[PDB]
């Protein structure tokens, strides 16, 4: 029932209403998600990182979506089968170095097996608290905005 475009637009809406991306941002992300897939498989649980290369970006932010039912994403690397994604990290990077820092931080946090197990059961407030604590401890992540309304379940 939940498509890729629905996920992209739902994760982009709070960034648009808070003034950190332009309106067309989502419409471009979808486009890039067709040409540059962002599907990742980390110990069964799938992860997607939709983002742009700085276009339509006013400030840095993360938008987290927790899919209760997996949605198929084309893999970052080639495979005969796609990736059943349950966790989506919408990335709004203004410069290339910000995008690289956020990508490295996401790579570091998705390998956390217990944290990825907790992400699929905690509420929005607890996910916000955990991700805020993990962002404050990262010296490369600070400068990226993260609010309570940047986390949502899509069931």
């Amino acid at each position, epitope marked *: 029932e939940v498509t890729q475009e629905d996920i992209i637009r739902a994760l982009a809406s709070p960034l648009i209403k808070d003034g950190m991306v332009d309106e*067309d941002f989502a419409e*471009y992300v979808i*486009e890039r998600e067709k*040409r*540059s897939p962002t599907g*990742l498989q980390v110990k069964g649980v799938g992860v997607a*990182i939709p983002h742009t*290369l*700085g*276009e339509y970006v006013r400030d840095n932010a993360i938008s987290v979506g927790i899919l209760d039912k997996p949605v198929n994403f084309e893999g*970052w*690397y*080639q495979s*005969p089968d796609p990736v059943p994604v349950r966790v989506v990290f919408m990335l709004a990077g203004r410069t290339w170095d910000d995008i*690289v820092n956020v*990508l*490295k931080w996401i*790579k570091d946090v998705i390998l956390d097996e217990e944290f990825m197990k907790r992400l699929l059961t905690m509420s929005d407030e607890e996910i916000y608290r955990q991700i805020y604590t993990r962002i404050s401890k990262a010296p490369g992540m600070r400068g990226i905005h993260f609010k309570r309304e940047y986390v949502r379940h899509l069931g």
Partner: antibody
Amino acid sequence: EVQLVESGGALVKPGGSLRLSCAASGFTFSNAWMSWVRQAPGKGLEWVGRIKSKTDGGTTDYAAPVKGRFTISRDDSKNTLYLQMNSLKTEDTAVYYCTTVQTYYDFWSGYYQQHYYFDYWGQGTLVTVSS
Amino acid sequence: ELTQDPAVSVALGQTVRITCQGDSLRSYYASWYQQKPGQAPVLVIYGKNNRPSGIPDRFSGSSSGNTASLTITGAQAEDEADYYCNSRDSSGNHLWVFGGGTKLTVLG
């Protein structure tokens, strides 16, 4: 759905000028890096030039056998790419394709190099430089 | 610069390995392009081993040191075409260089 149509291929005298156009459809042309590639009769692919988007500076780069004679411009409002060619020579006789440029980078490797490639190609227009 | 074999033969149904040689391939992936006689080049392999839109899974890409190899498993008559490799040459020579191209011939 992505369509790139070249136009402007005609006969031109050595030392003359010629402007090739390429109309783009099926994608946001404003955010796409564009490139011109050429292929001489019976030879291989030779990258002519490249132009970036306005978000990345709109800068332009050319190949050595083209520097000082060719120019690459773009009208994003018309979704059109232009290649102006001056001081033409017989070696410039070739089929010219307009390609779009995409980028790729690794995630797990730890290194984040950008590797650009040409994923969408037009059918090309033939420029003949003869007297 | 990038170096390819000018011509390569393969039996119908067998696996062929066309290779691209260049120093820059030590630190950059190569992109591969197929050009059938009178048509325009099409992208078949980009990055480590990625395929676009609707490209058959018979095409695979690999990199080992200073070489990059496009691997066609189960050759067919429609593969009889020219294949070009592309990567960033050295540094400030140009920016994108194509190999001389390999003319694939499917025999039987």
